[PDB]
Amino acid sequence: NLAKGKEESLDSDLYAELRCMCIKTTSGIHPKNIQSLEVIGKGTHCNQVEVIATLKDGRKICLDPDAPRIKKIVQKKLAGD
C-alpha cells in the first residue's frame, strides 16, 4: 500500500509503539544460529527495547528482551574467550 491511507494492516494498535520495528518475537532460537544482534533502546514512538537478531543464514528475527532465556542467550553471545 503506497499512498496516504494506512491503518488497515498489522501496524501497531498502540500509540506508544507506533514506531517499533518488531510486530512480535521468535522463541526457540539457538545462540549458535545467531550471527549478530542489535539491542535498540526505547525511542519516542517505541516504548519497548527491541532485539533484532541476524541469523547465520540471513534470517532476521526479533527476540524478547524480557525473556530470561534471551538475556542468557545474549550473555552467551558476549562470552568468547
UniProtKB/Swiss-Prot annotation:
Disulphides: C20-C46, C22-C62
Sequence intervals crossing the membrane: none
Top-level taxon: Eukaryota
Official protein name in the record: Connective tissue-activating peptide III(1-81)
Species per Swiss-Prot/TrEMBL record: Homo sapiens
Taxonomic classification: Eukaryota, Metazoa, Chordata, Craniata, Vertebrata
Stretch of the intact protein here: 44 to 124 of 128
